[PDB]
Amino acid sequence: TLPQTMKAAVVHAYGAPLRIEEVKVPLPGPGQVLVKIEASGVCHTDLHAAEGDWPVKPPLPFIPGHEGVGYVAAVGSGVTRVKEGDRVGIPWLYTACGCCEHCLTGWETLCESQQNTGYSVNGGYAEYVLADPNYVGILPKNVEFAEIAPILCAGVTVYKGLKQTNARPGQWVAISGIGGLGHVAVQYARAMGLHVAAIDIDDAKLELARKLGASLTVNARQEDPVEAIQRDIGGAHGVLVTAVSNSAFGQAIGMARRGGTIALVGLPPGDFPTPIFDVVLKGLHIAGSIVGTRADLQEALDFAGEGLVKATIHPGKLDDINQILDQMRAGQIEGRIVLEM
Amino acid sequence: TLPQTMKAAVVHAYGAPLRIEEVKVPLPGPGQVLVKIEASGVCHTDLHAAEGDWPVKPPLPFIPGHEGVGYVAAVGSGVTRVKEGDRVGIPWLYTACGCCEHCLTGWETLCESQQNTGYSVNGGYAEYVLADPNYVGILPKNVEFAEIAPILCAGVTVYKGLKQTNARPGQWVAISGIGGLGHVAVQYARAMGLHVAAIDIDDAKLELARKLGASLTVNARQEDPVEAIQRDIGGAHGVLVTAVSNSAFGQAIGMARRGGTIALVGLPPGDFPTPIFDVVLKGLHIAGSIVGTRADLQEALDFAGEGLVKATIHPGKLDDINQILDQMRAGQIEGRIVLEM
Amino acid sequence: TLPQTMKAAVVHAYGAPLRIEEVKVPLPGPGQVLVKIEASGVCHTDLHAAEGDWPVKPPLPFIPGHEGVGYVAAVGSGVTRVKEGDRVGIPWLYTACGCCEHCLTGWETLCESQQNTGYSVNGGYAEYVLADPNYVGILPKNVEFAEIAPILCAGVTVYKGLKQTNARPGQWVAISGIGGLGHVAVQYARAMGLHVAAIDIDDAKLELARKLGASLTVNARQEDPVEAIQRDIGGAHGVLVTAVSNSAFGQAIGMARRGGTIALVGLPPGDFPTPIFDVVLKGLHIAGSIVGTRADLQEALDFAGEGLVKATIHPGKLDDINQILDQMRAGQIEGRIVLEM
Amino acid sequence: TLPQTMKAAVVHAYGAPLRIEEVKVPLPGPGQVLVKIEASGVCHTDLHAAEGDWPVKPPLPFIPGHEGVGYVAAVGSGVTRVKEGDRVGIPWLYTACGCCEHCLTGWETLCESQQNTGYSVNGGYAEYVLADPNYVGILPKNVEFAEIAPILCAGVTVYKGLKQTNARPGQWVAISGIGGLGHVAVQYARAMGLHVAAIDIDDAKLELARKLGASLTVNARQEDPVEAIQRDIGGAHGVLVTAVSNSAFGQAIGMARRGGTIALVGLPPGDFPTPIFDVVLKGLHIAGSIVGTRADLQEALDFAGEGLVKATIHPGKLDDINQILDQMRAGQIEGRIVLEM
Numbered sequence A, B, C, D: 001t002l003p004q005t006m007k008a009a010v011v012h013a014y015g016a017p018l019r020i021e022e023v024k025v026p027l028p029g030p031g032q033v034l035v036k037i038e039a040s041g042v043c044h045t046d047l048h049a050a051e052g053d054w055p056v057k058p059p060l061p062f063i064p065g066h067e068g069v070g071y072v073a074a075v076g077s078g079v080t081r082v083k084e085g086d087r088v089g090i091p092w093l094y095t096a097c098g099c100c101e102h103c104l105t106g107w108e109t110l111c112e113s114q115q116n117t118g119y120s121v122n123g124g125y126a127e128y129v130l131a132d133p134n135y136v137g138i139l140p141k142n143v144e145f146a147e148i149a150p151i152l153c154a155g156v157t158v159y160k161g162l163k164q165t166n167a168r169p170g171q172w173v174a175i176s177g178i179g180g181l182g183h184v185a186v187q188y189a190r191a192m193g194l195h196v197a198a199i200d201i202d203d204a205k206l207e208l209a210r211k212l213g214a215s216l217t218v219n220a221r222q223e224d225p226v227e228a229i230q231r232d233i234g235g236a237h238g239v240l241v242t243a244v245s246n247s248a249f250g251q252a253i254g255m256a257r258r259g260g261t262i263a264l265v266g267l268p269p270g271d272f273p274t275p276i277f278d279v280v281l282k283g284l285h286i287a288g289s290i291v292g293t294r295a296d297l298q299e300a301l302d303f304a305g306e307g308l309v310k311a312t313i314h315p316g317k318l319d320d321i322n323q324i325l326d327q328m329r330a331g332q333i334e335g336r337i338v339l340e341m
């Protein structure tokens, strides 16, 4: 029964490598539940969090991680949505007010009163996590913790981004960047009746793309994505930008078909110059997309449950976390790194 | 009995003054008609064309003008849509192929085989204009030439742009740039049940907006437009950028509410900045819109026929086109200047 | 402080006239609030409730009324959305689970776990009402209780139904039945940029329609609505069916323009024969619409607050309720009857 | 060198057997082409036409067939879209005006000035057919005549119907009637990422559906289809009714999930029942869909070109058309019977 104490990679300074330190096990107060983390995925956003890469930096000291999945250990008072033992996941969208303009219209994702797991509230880089039962993800029974962990963020984000491009079955989607989110985006696009064109700067990643269903591949370092896509398919109906690069964005605009949509999911910093003439005359749409809604999450989880999407995960230990992060900043990760516990 | 010769304003060199000269009156070939210009609107696009601001420039020399309105004076063989004496207008979209992806799906506007009146084909800065009967606008009988001229471009464009915004009745739309396009957008926006926030850089232009239905008025030369819209209404559900300013485009994006849509219609040369991080986290949509479809055009014209939209025009003479364009360069025009032949 | 006892028109038998009987004043338990009813509208659905007109009949004995508006008298424990004294309204949608397929996607209105005010839970035909703070309507400060009461049901229902027809500004909407919901539907349609065609079987009601903005009127008892609408406007883009009649439905289908949408809001019983050939070949859409979502309710309330919609209300006393109901079953009501208290 | 005479199956009286007779081979007038029929699909619409089941009947005598496929044999003057030797098909939508509300908005399908192949104009139950080059389907080069014939109607229709359903990848669609249209709808539905529940009245037809991708199979002659779909999947997000049965239409509506859409494509004569109360409370949408647009047709054909859809066909001879239609009357056809000239 509850260790009363757990280990967790905590962040005390922006840029200062985390430190595994046995800390207290939270207690499920009213409207809360405790989750024993079985697996926990490592998202690129975890780096941006402990690296104070964004305007609203994470209050220190925090525990990152929003791809934490496990069993409901304890149940706070009033909790109806989940019971003890339930296999659940705690995503980026920790909570939302539930009654504002966006929450009432199905866009809780844009709620200004939201909390974010592993950023403004402690996450899954620990053995236990406190979660809001109403925003937690109900996992499919037929998939192991290590496998669905990625869906908790890379999965929903990519799935929702694809919905945001509005590309219909039989059409093309150009996926810029086949990394953590990218290799899983190829699978969702596939399952959504879309022809996939994969763009990256590493042949290994491009190879994985073909294994996953991509019928067109382009190494942006060996050839121009823009004219390759425009020449071979006439422009993609939808474009999903995963790349964190600077040039990737401009090439995404250029790879788009007339009247097509470029869905932005990557979070690079700063303003990006965009061709006025091209966007207006070609009637291009640029859509910003953040993770997913609870409905999006459940839908994204269903695809995994149907076996239509399998994340390419590589195991990792909680203490080797710093090595793992440095590996992602260097882009030396092939797929998604899910922490075992 | 058709002059055989006519006066027209010609652009022979970029940046150079136009020259009023005598040119041969064209004869309607098989699928064409000759329109006798009665009124002709001056659009800022004519400035960009005469100045050679865009990536794709208008071959020289040429006669500008895509807000030309008048009577069908002669009909070529095989023409069926209109007949001699019909009151008709020749807009930016001169023709389209009629059988490509875009043309078949209600987006002839994105057709790659289109021609543009007063740019790639001669336009209305003349006494007569050749035209494709199939793309000409059919004018409402109760509105006078000079008054409906602006709807051939400023009206359709702005109307389709407001539709691309997806703002529904009761919602707010921030319109940046209250000129030829903008002053008419205020009217279409009101007729569409929207609350209007107008942004410009001249108090006289904001007063025109107020007179036309704008509830909130902001002068960007006196205060920060972004914090003004964000402070006074919390951001607009829809934003329509008409302004010939790259920075105005960046500010426009900052005027949107979470989940809002920014329709880009202005064509200043160069690039505009996309704050990816903000666009993503706020779930913003940016949409480039080009003039309007034939269906869009007739719908736009109907609003004018209903008296719901009335362009603010000022008469002009073909011989004074250089000083008129100078007046536009200096932003000294209230609404639109419409040439009368 | 709380009367501890209140009067209320209760229903003890389906068909057996209600009876005003001083009963206990409910106490706001956790997650609840008490509302002192200042005004309470009488909806046609109240008859269907005490007349066991529907499959799932109201548990007896109940207090009908879902257009009850007043002040928040008491606040249960945990309540955050509303404070004591707040002017609020309790609509048809009493509560919903908040985490099901429909609730997560913005359609709480279709929640199978919902409760309905004045049907499955006591309503506003009393001096006080227990409500769920999260589904109650936040009223606009500038409108008196007697006036916004109708919006709590007739308003939102009609507003949402109009949205469901998808008729865009500048287009036509045929409103079949200008009664409780109908006369307020003419105002919303008006405020939504729609041209209104009013259909009824009473000239008095049709007269009110013209006063409210209808530009086309038809007494279905004096002339055929179908050919009148088809001849005068070519078919309405949208049709909103308020009538409880049998023939009204078939005429609504016939009054629709090709590709148009007939939005059903009226709740007559039984199956209605529909022309297969006409619906298929004319690409007609039939949309069932129930009251509104919390977002729809707030949006509908905003129109009243802007003064764009004014319900035509007639005062009534709680004890004269039976007379009032018999008056509605006979169709002798001109507008909406709001109970004073 | 063009026979000058050809064999064709003619309908001279409703209900009476067709007569194979010699008729003059038409000559392409100005905007026409002559197509030499190589394969011709038998559609149930041909039965309704020969039987005179519809409100608007086909003038007698006439040659049915709107799934006629072949080579352009002769071109009239002014024809530009196709040229001699092109593999092309003549569908139900023979021509349209090209400039009305519907034609200009991507809905030429609803054009009031259209003509229908094998109904108001002679069709493919012959060796040659006159056609309007602008509405003919352009066949993929890698698919054989007999195999693509059904896409000219069964395929496009069913494909556009599934789109009208609005069911997105991962969702369920219940397809009622697995015949010519239905067996091909199962394939388009799968290619669109949908889970398929097939309903028919013959086990052999359900087995065909299973082989083509259906997950749930229901025989309406053995069990209540409605409670079966409602029990096994809780209702389908989308429903597509192909069945030549009025009651099947009522049952189809009962197969939808709350908020679901039922696309009506079948054309049995008479009316279908709309349970208004259920449609309203469940927020259901009923949509009538007619064949498909030229854009729809090319998209439908592309799926076939991609090998994602393959019609199950059986060869037939023009001389055996009466026995073939008898076979259809008795529901003894597996998929489609395609005549080979």
Ligand SMILES: NC(=O)c1ccc[n+]([C@@H]2O[C@H](COP(=O)([O-])OP(=O)(O)OC[C@H]3O[C@@H](n4cnc5c(N)ncnc54)[C@H](O)[C@@H]3O)[C@@H](O)[C@H]2O)c1
Pocket: A043, A044, A045, A048, A153, A154, A157, A176, A177, A178, A179, A180, A181, A182, A199, A200, A201, A202, A205, A220, A242, A243, A244, A245, A246, A247, A248, A264, A265, A266, A267, A268, A289, A290, A291, A292, A328, A331, A333, B280
């Ligand atoms: N929108 C959201 O809700 C959300 C959720 C997931 C992560 N994040 C964002 O996702 C991004 C990282 O994705 P992962 O998928 O987490 O990261 P990753 O580092 O594993 O993958 C990025 C991929 O981009 C590719 N790439 C780099 N430059 C490129 C170029 N010029 N052209 C084409 N491809 C290029 C790399 O080769 C790599 O495979 C970050 O910007 C992060 O902040 C956002």
Ligand SMILES: NC(=O)c1ccc[n+]([C@@H]2O[C@H](COP(=O)([O-])OP(=O)(O)OC[C@H]3O[C@@H](n4cnc5c(N)ncnc54)[C@H](O)[C@@H]3O)[C@@H](O)[C@H]2O)c1
Pocket: A280, B043, B044, B045, B046, B048, B153, B154, B157, B176, B177, B178, B179, B180, B181, B182, B199, B200, B201, B202, B205, B220, B242, B243, B244, B245, B247, B248, B264, B265, B266, B267, B268, B289, B290, B291, B292, B328, B331, B333, B335
């Ligand atoms: N996308 C299309 O289909 C389309 C069709 C119409 C015209 N054009 C473009 O519309 C633009 C001009 O519109 P008109 O309506 O033709 O022009 P205009 O010159 O009459 O009006 C432009 C308005 O922008 C205002 N403005 C300038 N700088 C501003 C700033 N920083 N912030 C806010 N407002 C500012 C001016 O004061 C002026 O009122 C041109 O770029 C033209 O090419 C595009």
Ligand SMILES: NC(=O)c1ccc[n+]([C@@H]2O[C@H](COP(=O)([O-])OP(=O)(O)OC[C@H]3O[C@@H](n4cnc5c(N)ncnc54)[C@H](O)[C@@H]3O)[C@@H](O)[C@H]2O)c1
Pocket: C043, C044, C045, C048, C153, C154, C157, C176, C177, C178, C179, C180, C181, C182, C199, C200, C201, C202, C205, C220, C242, C243, C244, C245, C246, C247, C248, C264, C265, C266, C267, C268, C289, C290, C291, C292, C328, C331, C333, D280
């Ligand atoms: N969908 C919902 O959420 C919802 C909410 C409001 C009320 N209800 C339904 O609204 C209906 C009653 O509306 P009110 O607006 O409450 O009722 P009402 O009785 O005041 O008005 C009905 C109107 O129908 C008109 N009418 C009757 N026969 C007609 C015909 N053949 N053609 C044209 N008009 C005809 C009458 O003259 C009358 O004005 C009921 O069916 C009720 O159950 C449904």
Ligand SMILES: NC(=O)c1ccc[n+]([C@@H]2O[C@H](COP(=O)([O-])OP(=O)(O)OC[C@H]3O[C@@H](n4cnc5c(N)ncnc54)[C@H](O)[C@@H]3O)[C@@H](O)[C@H]2O)c1
Pocket: C280, D043, D044, D045, D046, D048, D153, D154, D157, D176, D177, D178, D179, D180, D181, D182, D199, D200, D201, D202, D205, D220, D242, D243, D244, D245, D247, D248, D264, D265, D266, D267, D268, D289, D290, D291, D292, D328, D331, D333, D335
């Ligand atoms: N709306 C359109 O654009 C369009 C275009 C294609 C064909 N048509 C219509 O499609 C229908 C025929 O389709 P085919 O695909 O041409 O016909 P078909 O005869 O090959 O197939 C009809 C199928 O319906 C099944 N069926 C009969 N009764 C049923 C019931 N009660 N429940 C479930 N299934 C039942 C049959 O067993 C059969 O498999 C006709 O009404 C025809 O006119 C319409």
Ligand SMILES: [Zn+2]
Pocket: A043, A044, A045, A046, A066, A092, A153, A154
């Ligand atoms: Zn993440």
Ligand SMILES: [Zn+2]
Pocket: A096, A097, A098, A099, A100, A101, A102, A103, A108, A111, A112, A113
């Ligand atoms: Zn919120």
Ligand SMILES: [Zn+2]
Pocket: B043, B044, B045, B046, B066, B092, B153, B154
């Ligand atoms: Zn212009």
Ligand SMILES: [Zn+2]
Pocket: B096, B097, B098, B099, B100, B101, B102, B103, B108, B111, B112, B113
């Ligand atoms: Zn084209």
Ligand SMILES: [Zn+2]
Pocket: C043, C044, C045, C046, C066, C092, C153, C154
């Ligand atoms: Zn009601």
Ligand SMILES: [Zn+2]
Pocket: C096, C097, C098, C099, C100, C101, C102, C103, C108, C111, C112, C113
């Ligand atoms: Zn619910």
Ligand SMILES: [Zn+2]
Pocket: D043, D044, D045, D046, D066, D092, D153, D154
């Ligand atoms: Zn057919």
Ligand SMILES: [Zn+2]
Pocket: D096, D097, D098, D099, D100, D101, D102, D103, D108, D111, D112, D113
């Ligand atoms: Zn037409």
